[PDB]
């Protein structure tokens, strides 16, 4: 324009670049945006009901293949016969089986004691997990109503009760809508109120990583701001270990001896698992916990294999390389791999030869090859989300857990490159300078390989840090049953006798803004954590002393009732303004609205006790010319206090002069108006 | 010289714009690339095959 020969075009270039910088950051936020694992809930066998118990099975190298379930009353009798071709016999004589299958809380989830008998245990556990995964990600499970949030559940349709053409007595129309894989992801979105893509995918034993991949690819784009991605296989009938045994694919002892010379086949188990997932710059902007980031995912069918159940050796290399070129990484960044490790004698040699071809390509540091199934059992459709719970507790515990049955590494694989180090021992895995990434791979019977690359959470240096000790807030307990509320203060009590000195403000933040406002409420404001621990033990027995118990029906709607006269004491709020500036300042606006209409101000009145109010020209109560405005000022400041603490009235009603305060707080009369 | 900054900072603007015209038609193909229906097979109620 004027100076030199550039003052205008160099503004359109600045803009064409900050538009190119902001349009090529939109391409990397739509196909490669990290998807944070906001929380993980899992009902894996071995009594595992939560990942902390799960970090307590992998770390001690405990196998969870105990035996067949007798809690459902199976016909194990016939599941076994010397002749192994009997049409109804099973070869797995063990396996990882949970007792949480024949167990559910119908009343909590709003289903009748007849609609729930029909509820397929796969869905039944998924409903319980959907509530937990939220209750441990912070997000109140009842706060996600009409919120875009996809439920992506992976399920191998399994057969529960009477055939749909042989309807029961109470279970009849609800036998198809409680068992259709359709309504496992759908029951969740209904009970939780979610309005997002509630898709129940089915890709055999990769339906958890496919559901995780289908949720990550539903997030990178944006159709659901949040997403619950996971999968469950709880096997109601012994109909899967009696068919898988008919193709002689099972092991006679139920162990998935991954990458081991004793490999017999799958050690088929049953389990669940759910991940709460959100775009990494949506779980940092909302403060949600970020446990690990799912960098990239890939799904790749085996193609024309040598059998439907037969694995492809060059369709896994193209899925370990699609998830490795969609995450923007390379084969040398992934420290460890949670491989399928089915324990098969022709699927493990093919898996690992696909792992020396996509990862073990001149590896400077050996790949730590490990398998949750070994410690657990082929979790079928829950395997792949039980590998992103294993390799997300491996992120956050600084340790690669064991592969429990692989000391005698199989002789059908070539472990000569020294590029893969099967995890026969707990390998330390601390936070170094290079990000800690892992790979979880689930390949299925249908021939749909899936591979997901996990990375450790971006090191949060400060985040929500410490300020100062001060007034303590109520410990907010609530449950949907009077016997479940005793169990809440029988599990928070333990979560503090196991973890003592836990900041009270932190047990009143993730209990109040971390849980749902369920009917049976027992909040309590505790001076100390032992005062608390005391009330916690009292509520375990139902004895409320120091605890504010109550009952509700999702009630809300408080009413500010305003007494006219007779509620004054000699020291009304003497320290209520000395402890918080939300009452002192609340008094300040009333005072400056009372100064032009009153001489003596309210500030020194409630500041001083009656024993010291006798010398400030303001009697304790008899001065109706002074205490009536004081009453109104105390009243309005207190009402503003409850409003500042989130207590808003559905109605204000005043008695005689509390009418003035009610009008002041209702908005019909200004602060100065009602003050005058 | 190159017509100082008249034929240069305007030569970099036909790249930073022609790259913006190709980094925005990648976003219109990552979100709204219209997919075809190349063929349709149906076995539906009745004689439909």
């Amino acid at each position, epitope marked *: 324009m*004027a*100076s030199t020969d550039s*003052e*205008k075009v160099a503004e*359109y270039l*600045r*803009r064409a670049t900050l538009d190119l910088r902001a*349009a090529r950051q939109r391409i990397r936020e739509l196909e490669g945006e990290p998807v944070a694992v906001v929380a993980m809930a899992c009902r894996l066998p071995g009594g595992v009901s939560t990942p902390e118990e799960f970090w307590e099975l992998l770390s001690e190298g405990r196998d969870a293949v105990a035996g067949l379930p007798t809690d459902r009353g199976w016909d194990l009798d016939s599941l076994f016969h010397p002749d192994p071709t009997r049409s109804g016999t099973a070869h797995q004589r063990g396996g990882g089986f949970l007792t949480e299958a024949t167990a559910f809380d119908p009343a909590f989830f709003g289903m009748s004691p007849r609609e729930a008998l029909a509820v397929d245990p796969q869905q039944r556990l998924m409903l319980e997990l959907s509530w937990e995964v939220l209750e441990r990600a912070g997000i109140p499970p009842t706060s996600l109503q009409a919120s875009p949030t996809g439920v992506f559940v992976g399920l191998i349709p399994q057969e529960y009760g009477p055939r749909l053409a042989e309807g029961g007595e109470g279970v009849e129309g609800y036998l198809m809508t409680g068992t259709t894989t359709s309504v496992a992801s759908g029951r969740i979105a209904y009970t939780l109120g979610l309005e997002g893509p509630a898709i129940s995918v089915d890709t055999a034993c990769s339906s958890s990583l496919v559901a995780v991949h289908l949720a990550c690819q539903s997030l990178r784009r944006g159709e659901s701001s949040l997403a619950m991605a996971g999968g469950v296989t709880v096997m109601p009938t012994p109909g899967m270990l009696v068919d898988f045994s008919r193709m002689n694919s099972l092991a006679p002892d139920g162990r998935c001896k991954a990458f081991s010379a004793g490999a017999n086949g799958f050690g088929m188990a049953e389990g669940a698992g759910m991940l709460l997932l959100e775009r990494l710059s949506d779980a940092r902007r909302n403060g949600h916990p970020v446990l690990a980031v799912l960098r990239g995912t890939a799904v790749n069918s085996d193609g024309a294999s040598n059998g439907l159940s037969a694995p492809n050796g060059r369709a896994q290399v193209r899925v370990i390389q699609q998830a490795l070129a969609e995450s923007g990484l390379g084969p040398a960044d992934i420290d460890a791999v949670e491989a399928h490790g089915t324990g098969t004698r022709l699927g493990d040699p093919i898996e690992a030869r696909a792992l020396f071809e996509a990862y073990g390509r001149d590896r400077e540091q050996p790949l730590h090859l490990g398998s949750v199934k070994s410690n657990l059992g082929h979790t079928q459709a829950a395997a792949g989300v039980a590998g992103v719970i294993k390799m997300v507790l491996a992120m956050r515990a600084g340790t690669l857990p064991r592969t429990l049955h692989a000391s005698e590494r199989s002789k059908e694989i070539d472990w000569s490159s020294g590029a893969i180090s099967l995890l026969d021992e707990p390998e330390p895995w601390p936070a170094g300078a290079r990000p800690r990434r892992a790979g979880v791979s689930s390949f299925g019977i249908s021939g749909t390989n899936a591979h997901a690359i996990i990375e450790e959470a971006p090191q949060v240096v400060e985040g929500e840090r410490v300020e100062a000790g001060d007034v303590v807030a109520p410990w907010v307990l609530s449950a949907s049953s009077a016997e479940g509320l005793r169990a809440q203060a029988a599990r928070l009590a333990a979560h503090l006798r196991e973890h003592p000195g836990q900041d009270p403000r932190d047990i009143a933040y993730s209990l109040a803004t971390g849980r749902a406002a369920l009917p049976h409420r027992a909040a309590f404001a505790p001076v100390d954590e032992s005062a608390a621990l005391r009330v916690l033990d009292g509520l375990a027995t139902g004895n409320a002393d120091g605890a504010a118990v109550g009952t509700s029906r999702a009630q809300q709607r408080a009413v500010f009732v305003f007494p006219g006269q007779g509620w004054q004491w000699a020291g009304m709020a003497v320290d209520l303004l000395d402890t918080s500036p939300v009452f002192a300042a609340a008094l300040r606006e009333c005072a400056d609205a009372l100064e032009p209409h009153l001489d003596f101000e309210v500030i020194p009145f409630l500041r001083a006790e009656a024993a010291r109010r006798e010398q400030d020209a303001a009697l304790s109560t008899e001065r109706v010319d002074v205490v009536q405005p004081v009453m109104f000022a105390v009243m309005v400041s207190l009402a503003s206090m409850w409003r500042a603490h989130g207590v808003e009235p559905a109605a204000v009603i005043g008695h005689s002069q509390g009418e003035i305060a009610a009008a002041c707080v209702a908005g019909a009369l200004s602060l100065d108006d009602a003050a005058r | 010289m190159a017509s100082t900054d008249s034929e240069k900072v*305007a030569e970099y603007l036909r790249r930073a*714009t022609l790259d913006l015209r190709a980094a925005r038609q990648r976003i219109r193909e990552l979100e709204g690339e219209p997919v075809a229906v190349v063929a349709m097979a149906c076995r539906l109620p009745g004689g439909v095959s």
Partner: antibody
Amino acid sequence: EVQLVQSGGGLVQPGRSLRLSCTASGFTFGDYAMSWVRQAPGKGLEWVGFIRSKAYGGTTEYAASVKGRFTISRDDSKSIAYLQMNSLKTEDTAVYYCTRGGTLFDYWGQGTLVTVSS
Amino acid sequence: DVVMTQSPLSLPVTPGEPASISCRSSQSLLHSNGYNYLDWYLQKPGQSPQLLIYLGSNRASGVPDRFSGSGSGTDFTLKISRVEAEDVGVYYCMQSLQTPRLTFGPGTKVDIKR
């Protein structure tokens, strides 16, 4: 983000001195050439002036309507643009904006309502 | 001299219907670089003016894809592919060839059409 948040409106009598501050946070303040566009109540935008970048000289170009009256400055270490409005008359009752471009107005800020009434 | 730019000052838009504001310049805004020096600004009613288009056809980031840009050296056009309830206001055709520009133009007074 870039946010050009402004401050400094108010009520004065014709012939006063008023300050208009443009807080720039999100971009390198010294690269752009901030400008101040006036919009009298309910009519079209009129451009008051703009300071060139410190690297472009810092020459300040003003309008014909306000030459010898207004002066515009900028600071990087304190990262603020200034419209120094001296000898105001009745015309300055308006919503003054701060855009981040001499020929390519960008963020525009928010809108500082300045009023010059007697 | 100065570039005099005019437009359909009182253009009505009905929601969901493509609309088209046009600009006509007396002089030629196609500078030698082959880049037009016309910009399209939007002042939404009672808000800070927005930059919709720079260099005639290029759209600023953060601006809805609806606003499309085109034009020769004299006649120009803004093609809103989809007018919604935020697409209403004043559309200023503002040149860049001859800075300084004391005015942003009369601006196209856009209205929801009935």
